[PDB]
Amino acid sequence: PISPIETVPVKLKPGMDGPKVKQWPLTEEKIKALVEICTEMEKEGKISKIGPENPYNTPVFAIKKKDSTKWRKLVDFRELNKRTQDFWEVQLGIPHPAGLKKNKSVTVLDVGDAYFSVPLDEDFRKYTAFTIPSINNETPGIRYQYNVLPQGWKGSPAIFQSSMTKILEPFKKQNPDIVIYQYMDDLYVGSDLEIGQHRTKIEELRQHLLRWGLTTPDKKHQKEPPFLWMGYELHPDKWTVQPIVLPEKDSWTVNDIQKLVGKLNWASQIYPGIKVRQLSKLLRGTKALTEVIPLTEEAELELAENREILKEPVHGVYYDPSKDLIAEIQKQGQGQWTYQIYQEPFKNLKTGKYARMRGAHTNDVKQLTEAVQKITTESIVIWGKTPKFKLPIQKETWETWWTEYWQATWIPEWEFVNTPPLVKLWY
Amino acid sequence: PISPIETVPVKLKPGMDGPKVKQWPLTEEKIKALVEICTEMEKEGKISKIGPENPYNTPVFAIKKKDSTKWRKLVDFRELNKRTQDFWEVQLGIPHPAGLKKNKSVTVLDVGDAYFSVPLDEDFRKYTAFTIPSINNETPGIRYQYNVLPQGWKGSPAIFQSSMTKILEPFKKQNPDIVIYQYMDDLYVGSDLEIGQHRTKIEELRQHLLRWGLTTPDKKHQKEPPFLWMGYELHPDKWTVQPIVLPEKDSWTVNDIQKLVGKLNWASQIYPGIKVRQLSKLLRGTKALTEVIPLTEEAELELAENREILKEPVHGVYYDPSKDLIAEIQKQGQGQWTYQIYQEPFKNLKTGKYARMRGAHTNDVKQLTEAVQKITTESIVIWGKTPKFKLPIQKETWETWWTEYWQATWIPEWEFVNTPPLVKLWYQLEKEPIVGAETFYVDGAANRETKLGKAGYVTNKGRQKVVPLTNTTNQKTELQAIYLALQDSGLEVNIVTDSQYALGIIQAQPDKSESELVNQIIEQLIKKEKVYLAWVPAHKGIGGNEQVDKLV
Ligand SMILES: Cc1cc(C#N)cc(C)c1Oc1nc(Nc2ccc(C#N)cc2)nc(N)c1Br
């Protein structure tokens, strides 16, 4: 009942103006997808065509979700978000369930659909301007602007929150043990139930939303068993700590102890438990690398004490909502990729290792871009928000492919990094 | 005539009003020049004589451009253009000829007074107010206001295009085959219908525009192949660049050299082989607009060879959505690479080069991928797809490379091209140490102040050496030392440093570097049969290097 015609006065933050981000160019494949997608949207009246009194423009890509047929237009409202929604991380913000990271299972459902009902502030519409490009500019971009809550723009959830709470009301009644956290376009439903039990609580809700006003595609695809894995289920309860493990050997050469010395040294901004002064000196002479050095020591009481202190998780690390999370990833080989989420250098909040294959059909990008997605999700569960990536790939290369295997409706923020040298020895 | 087109609404930047710049009286020869003109405009509805309180004014100059009888009025909008809201910018993107499909026959029109035929947001005319001087008497507030896209304003270009686009639309629908390209004042129209039919459709579109008030100053089509467009010459199976005349002075200043790289890079779209690293290298911190800069043997030679490549023409062909897109790369030098993309052999669509940014050191495999990437991004723009890459690198050199390389990467499938010089790994480091091979504990330091330093080694066999170094860096020495080692070692060796810095510069396994010293090492590495590099704690944890740190 906002005085304005169902428009919830939306407003960019003070002394801030609309987004003017460039549209990267896409393959003809995608241009075609996007024009088919948008021509409909125009007809369903979700978007309308704009003119030249609109300097504004946010990017847009075409991706393929859980499916492998129909395409999907994914707008990159990152800039528009930073420019509005912070004045909407407050006003109409949505709190975060500390237990969700706790529950046994968590399933994510995509409700980005509801939005297209609720009309957008007629005054703000102008900022959702996106352009569909031409090949070789042999014509000017097709220009459209939203009239409804666009999906992707952190405005929608916020604005729409009311309507949600309401819908979910019944379900939260019957089932009161189950948590439901929304984040942008997804619902994160978690339970203590057993496998198929949980998958029933979900499917009920699924049917609940579905019978009461809103479409709801993915948790999964179908009942057809082909022995796949793209069905999206989650389990906060296990994912935990890190393999900051030292090697277990039989014939220790110098090179072998020499390293052990600096790997254990490295952990001197982390675990206090060791300074290998004693183990270091066990090689003051200038012996040979290939050579062999024995076990009796004044110093081994260290590989002793240390081999265990490195197993007790360090405390003194505290999340901080004000600060931005920063995730790093190292390519480790054999389709293996480690990672750490921190806020303040060497005070790691979470450190894991997404792996896929070793040499199948997968490839370096795809995995990276898959590990990201993983980490991003884990992140949204734990602290209810996406981190900022320092990705080990060349800017231009990522910009050409990430679209490819990309699946989520959100885009984290990223930057590209150097040759972490010995930092690669984290696993 | 004028136009029934809807107007695009405009407005001034939030909290800003119209310009109020007064007129600088002048030659009554011009005050009489303008008056004539303005009358011919108002009689055409373009301009509109206004009243008293239209505060706004914008200077109107009148220049009878040299060697021409008529005069052309000129209004200076700078002020309004600062008060006008920003627009969706006029496609800055220019298509690349290599991406233009075909069309047996093309016509180019010339929507000139075009902008003067498109309506101007009513409520926005006020600010177009301008005045022409009263000969000093009767105080003429001879005031005229614009009712169209003033040939100078900010939103003029964009709004024209929009307005034009909306226009074509109808015509476009009755001839889904005729493709038309609009840009500035041109309108390129092309058909697959013999000159007979085709001309019908041009004459046709012609009047169509005219009913929209758009008058095309061409009884026939003033088209004159080749087309002199955006620095290119357009032909019926060939496209190339316009005359690229490369200067030759006894003295070159920064802006001299710049304009040169420019003409070079542009020429590189089709003149295979154009190099430019050395030249541009000259322009460094070269923020001295006019400061003579002596060329280098390097620069002159490149410049030379460039003159050599230019002396004989080269055409580029158009495009076939039907055939394939293939791009090949070949190495031509100092970390310089050149390429060309084609659908059929010995003709090209376009060509191009590639060198590394001021980035410390590189490597052949890394660099070639870097080229492939550039070609890929470019191909998606021009053609909207990725070409088939034929590359001079054995697939095993690249896997052993990408695989062990610490950084993500994905190059579509290519195809080996025996045409040497091949791209190979000049060497590899033993991942695992070397038994029997001597072990050198290498080191080098310098007083961060006195600018002095020394490099030297210590071995398992008891051999040692220290070499004096002056004017160096705690850095150039850490490498110095590694290098000293590789020098005295034998066919096989195990070096060990306290420099993650040095460690990592070699670790990357470069083959080319700006740093002569590294190149120095890169040399030696070649010779070694087996080389193993290791990094113990730089300082503190003082293991075996505990003894090279002191006497170095
Ligand atoms: C002629 C032209 C120029 C510019 C711009 N700028 C832009 C476009 C979209 C054009 O149409 C096309 N012209 C040609 N070749 C061509 C044919 C004849 C002549 C002549 N005479 C010149 C070029 N091939 C196409 N696929 C297209 Br589409």
mmCIF file with all atom_site columns, N, CA, C and O and ligand atoms in Angstrom, chain B residues 100-103 106 179 181 188 225 227 229 234-236 318, ligand 1:
data_model
loop_
_atom_site.group_PDB
_atom_site.id
_atom_site.type_symbol
_atom_site.label_atom_id
_atom_site.label_alt_id
_atom_site.label_comp_id
_atom_site.label_asym_id
_atom_site.label_entity_id
_atom_site.label_seq_id
_atom_site.pdbx_PDB_ins_code
_atom_site.Cartn_x
_atom_site.Cartn_y
_atom_site.Cartn_z
_atom_site.occupancy
_atom_site.B_iso_or_equiv
_atom_site.pdbx_formal_charge
_atom_site.auth_seq_id
_atom_site.auth_comp_id
_atom_site.auth_asym_id
_atom_site.auth_atom_id
_atom_site.pdbx_PDB_model_num
ATOM   1  N  N   . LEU B 1 100 ? 32.422 -8.198  -42.250 1.00 0.00 ? 100 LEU B N   1
ATOM   2  C  CA  . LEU B 1 100 ? 31.300 -7.843  -43.125 1.00 0.00 ? 100 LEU B CA  1
ATOM   3  C  C   . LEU B 1 100 ? 31.066 -9.036  -44.050 1.00 0.00 ? 100 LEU B C   1
ATOM   4  O  O   . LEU B 1 100 ? 31.994 -9.510  -44.709 1.00 0.00 ? 100 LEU B O   1
ATOM   5  N  N   . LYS B 1 101 ? 29.844 -9.534  -44.125 1.00 0.00 ? 101 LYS B N   1
ATOM   6  C  CA  . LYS B 1 101 ? 29.631 -10.705 -44.964 1.00 0.00 ? 101 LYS B CA  1
ATOM   7  C  C   . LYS B 1 101 ? 29.971 -10.536 -46.451 1.00 0.00 ? 101 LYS B C   1
ATOM   8  O  O   . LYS B 1 101 ? 31.149 -10.579 -46.793 1.00 0.00 ? 101 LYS B O   1
ATOM   9  N  N   . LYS B 1 102 ? 29.003 -10.312 -47.337 1.00 0.00 ? 102 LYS B N   1
ATOM   10 C  CA  . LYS B 1 102 ? 29.373 -10.235 -48.750 1.00 0.00 ? 102 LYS B CA  1
ATOM   11 C  C   . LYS B 1 102 ? 28.784 -9.118  -49.619 1.00 0.00 ? 102 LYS B C   1
ATOM   12 O  O   . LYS B 1 102 ? 29.386 -8.056  -49.784 1.00 0.00 ? 102 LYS B O   1
ATOM   13 N  N   . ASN B 1 103 ? 27.622 -9.445  -50.199 1.00 0.00 ? 103 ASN B N   1
ATOM   14 C  CA  . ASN B 1 103 ? 26.748 -8.634  -51.071 1.00 0.00 ? 103 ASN B CA  1
ATOM   15 C  C   . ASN B 1 103 ? 27.267 -8.093  -52.400 1.00 0.00 ? 103 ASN B C   1
ATOM   16 O  O   . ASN B 1 103 ? 27.948 -7.058  -52.480 1.00 0.00 ? 103 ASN B O   1
ATOM   17 N  N   . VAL B 1 106 ? 26.764 -2.872  -53.492 1.00 0.00 ? 106 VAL B N   1
ATOM   18 C  CA  . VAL B 1 106 ? 26.404 -1.879  -52.432 1.00 0.00 ? 106 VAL B CA  1
ATOM   19 C  C   . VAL B 1 106 ? 26.241 -0.386  -52.815 1.00 0.00 ? 106 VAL B C   1
ATOM   20 O  O   . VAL B 1 106 ? 27.009 0.147   -53.626 1.00 0.00 ? 106 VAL B O   1
ATOM   21 N  N   . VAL B 1 179 ? 20.515 -5.417  -46.373 1.00 0.00 ? 179 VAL B N   1
ATOM   22 C  CA  . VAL B 1 179 ? 21.007 -5.073  -45.050 1.00 0.00 ? 179 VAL B CA  1
ATOM   23 C  C   . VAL B 1 179 ? 21.527 -3.657  -45.152 1.00 0.00 ? 179 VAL B C   1
ATOM   24 O  O   . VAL B 1 179 ? 22.190 -3.302  -46.122 1.00 0.00 ? 179 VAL B O   1
ATOM   25 N  N   . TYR B 1 181 ? 23.527 -0.452  -43.080 1.00 0.00 ? 181 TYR B N   1
ATOM   26 C  CA  . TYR B 1 181 ? 24.406 -0.027  -42.011 1.00 0.00 ? 181 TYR B CA  1
ATOM   27 C  C   . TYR B 1 181 ? 24.426 1.473   -41.959 1.00 0.00 ? 181 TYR B C   1
ATOM   28 O  O   . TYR B 1 181 ? 24.669 2.166   -42.964 1.00 0.00 ? 181 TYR B O   1
ATOM   29 N  N   . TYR B 1 188 ? 25.088 2.672   -45.554 1.00 0.00 ? 188 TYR B N   1
ATOM   30 C  CA  . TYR B 1 188 ? 25.504 1.729   -46.578 1.00 0.00 ? 188 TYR B CA  1
ATOM   31 C  C   . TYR B 1 188 ? 24.372 0.728   -46.800 1.00 0.00 ? 188 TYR B C   1
ATOM   32 O  O   . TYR B 1 188 ? 23.897 0.121   -45.851 1.00 0.00 ? 188 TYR B O   1
ATOM   33 N  N   . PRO B 1 225 ? 33.108 3.713   -55.160 1.00 0.00 ? 225 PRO B N   1
ATOM   34 C  CA  . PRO B 1 225 ? 34.085 2.698   -54.742 1.00 0.00 ? 225 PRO B CA  1
ATOM   35 C  C   . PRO B 1 225 ? 35.499 3.061   -55.211 1.00 0.00 ? 225 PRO B C   1
ATOM   36 O  O   . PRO B 1 225 ? 35.673 3.697   -56.258 1.00 0.00 ? 225 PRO B O   1
ATOM   37 N  N   . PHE B 1 227 ? 35.175 2.494   -51.037 1.00 0.00 ? 227 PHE B N   1
ATOM   38 C  CA  . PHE B 1 227 ? 34.633 3.397   -50.033 1.00 0.00 ? 227 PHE B CA  1
ATOM   39 C  C   . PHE B 1 227 ? 35.650 3.819   -49.000 1.00 0.00 ? 227 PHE B C   1
ATOM   40 O  O   . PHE B 1 227 ? 36.286 3.004   -48.319 1.00 0.00 ? 227 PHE B O   1
ATOM   41 N  N   . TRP B 1 229 ? 35.990 4.793   -45.872 1.00 0.00 ? 229 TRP B N   1
ATOM   42 C  CA  . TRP B 1 229 ? 35.335 4.713   -44.539 1.00 0.00 ? 229 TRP B CA  1
ATOM   43 C  C   . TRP B 1 229 ? 36.278 4.372   -43.384 1.00 0.00 ? 229 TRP B C   1
ATOM   44 O  O   . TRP B 1 229 ? 37.100 3.455   -43.478 1.00 0.00 ? 229 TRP B O   1
ATOM   45 N  N   . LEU B 1 234 ? 36.958 0.321   -49.073 1.00 0.00 ? 234 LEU B N   1
ATOM   46 C  CA  . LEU B 1 234 ? 36.058 -0.796  -49.294 1.00 0.00 ? 234 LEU B CA  1
ATOM   47 C  C   . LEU B 1 234 ? 35.858 -1.114  -50.772 1.00 0.00 ? 234 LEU B C   1
ATOM   48 O  O   . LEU B 1 234 ? 35.448 -0.257  -51.560 1.00 0.00 ? 234 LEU B O   1
ATOM   49 N  N   . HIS B 1 235 ? 36.169 -2.353  -51.144 1.00 0.00 ? 235 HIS B N   1
ATOM   50 C  CA  . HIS B 1 235 ? 36.026 -2.843  -52.512 1.00 0.00 ? 235 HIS B CA  1
ATOM   51 C  C   . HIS B 1 235 ? 35.027 -4.014  -52.530 1.00 0.00 ? 235 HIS B C   1
ATOM   52 O  O   . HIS B 1 235 ? 34.445 -4.379  -51.502 1.00 0.00 ? 235 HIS B O   1
ATOM   53 N  N   . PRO B 1 236 ? 34.812 -4.610  -53.713 1.00 0.00 ? 236 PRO B N   1
ATOM   54 C  CA  . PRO B 1 236 ? 33.908 -5.752  -53.943 1.00 0.00 ? 236 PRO B CA  1
ATOM   55 C  C   . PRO B 1 236 ? 34.426 -7.203  -53.703 1.00 0.00 ? 236 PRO B C   1
ATOM   56 O  O   . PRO B 1 236 ? 33.831 -8.173  -54.180 1.00 0.00 ? 236 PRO B O   1
ATOM   57 N  N   . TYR B 1 318 ? 36.525 -10.419 -47.577 1.00 0.00 ? 318 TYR B N   1
ATOM   58 C  CA  . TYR B 1 318 ? 35.367 -10.337 -46.696 1.00 0.00 ? 318 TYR B CA  1
ATOM   59 C  C   . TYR B 1 318 ? 35.042 -11.658 -46.039 1.00 0.00 ? 318 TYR B C   1
ATOM   60 O  O   . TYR B 1 318 ? 35.924 -12.524 -45.937 1.00 0.00 ? 318 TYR B O   1
HETATM 61 C  C1  . LIG C 2 .   ? 29.063 -1.940  -47.775 1.00 0.00 ? 1   LIG C C1  1
HETATM 62 C  C2  . LIG C 2 .   ? 28.966 -1.896  -46.234 1.00 0.00 ? 1   LIG C C2  1
HETATM 63 C  C3  . LIG C 2 .   ? 29.794 -0.955  -45.537 1.00 0.00 ? 1   LIG C C3  1
HETATM 64 C  C4  . LIG C 2 .   ? 29.760 -0.843  -44.116 1.00 0.00 ? 1   LIG C C4  1
HETATM 65 C  C5  . LIG C 2 .   ? 30.595 0.103   -43.448 1.00 0.00 ? 1   LIG C C5  1
HETATM 66 N  N1  . LIG C 2 .   ? 31.310 0.855   -42.938 1.00 0.00 ? 1   LIG C N1  1
HETATM 67 C  C6  . LIG C 2 .   ? 28.904 -1.681  -43.351 1.00 0.00 ? 1   LIG C C6  1
HETATM 68 C  C7  . LIG C 2 .   ? 28.055 -2.642  -43.988 1.00 0.00 ? 1   LIG C C7  1
HETATM 69 C  C8  . LIG C 2 .   ? 27.167 -3.502  -43.068 1.00 0.00 ? 1   LIG C C8  1
HETATM 70 C  C9  . LIG C 2 .   ? 28.070 -2.780  -45.460 1.00 0.00 ? 1   LIG C C9  1
HETATM 71 O  O1  . LIG C 2 .   ? 27.231 -3.737  -46.107 1.00 0.00 ? 1   LIG C O1  1
HETATM 72 C  C10 . LIG C 2 .   ? 28.013 -4.924  -46.518 1.00 0.00 ? 1   LIG C C10 1
HETATM 73 N  N2  . LIG C 2 .   ? 28.983 -4.831  -47.503 1.00 0.00 ? 1   LIG C N2  1
HETATM 74 C  C11 . LIG C 2 .   ? 29.773 -5.929  -47.937 1.00 0.00 ? 1   LIG C C11 1
HETATM 75 N  N3  . LIG C 2 .   ? 30.744 -5.831  -48.916 1.00 0.00 ? 1   LIG C N3  1
HETATM 76 C  C12 . LIG C 2 .   ? 30.946 -4.794  -49.833 1.00 0.00 ? 1   LIG C C12 1
HETATM 77 C  C13 . LIG C 2 .   ? 30.337 -4.981  -51.101 1.00 0.00 ? 1   LIG C C13 1
HETATM 78 C  C14 . LIG C 2 .   ? 30.462 -3.992  -52.128 1.00 0.00 ? 1   LIG C C14 1
HETATM 79 C  C15 . LIG C 2 .   ? 31.209 -2.782  -51.914 1.00 0.00 ? 1   LIG C C15 1
HETATM 80 C  C16 . LIG C 2 .   ? 31.279 -1.845  -52.998 1.00 0.00 ? 1   LIG C C16 1
HETATM 81 N  N4  . LIG C 2 .   ? 31.298 -1.096  -53.898 1.00 0.00 ? 1   LIG C N4  1
HETATM 82 C  C17 . LIG C 2 .   ? 31.868 -2.513  -50.646 1.00 0.00 ? 1   LIG C C17 1
HETATM 83 C  C18 . LIG C 2 .   ? 31.741 -3.517  -49.603 1.00 0.00 ? 1   LIG C C18 1
HETATM 84 N  N5  . LIG C 2 .   ? 29.544 -7.160  -47.346 1.00 0.00 ? 1   LIG C N5  1
HETATM 85 C  C19 . LIG C 2 .   ? 28.588 -7.313  -46.359 1.00 0.00 ? 1   LIG C C19 1
HETATM 86 N  N6  . LIG C 2 .   ? 28.427 -8.523  -45.848 1.00 0.00 ? 1   LIG C N6  1
HETATM 87 C  C20 . LIG C 2 .   ? 27.806 -6.184  -45.925 1.00 0.00 ? 1   LIG C C20 1
HETATM 88 BR BR1 . LIG C 2 .   ? 26.572 -6.347  -44.626 1.00 0.00 ? 1   LIG C BR1 1
#
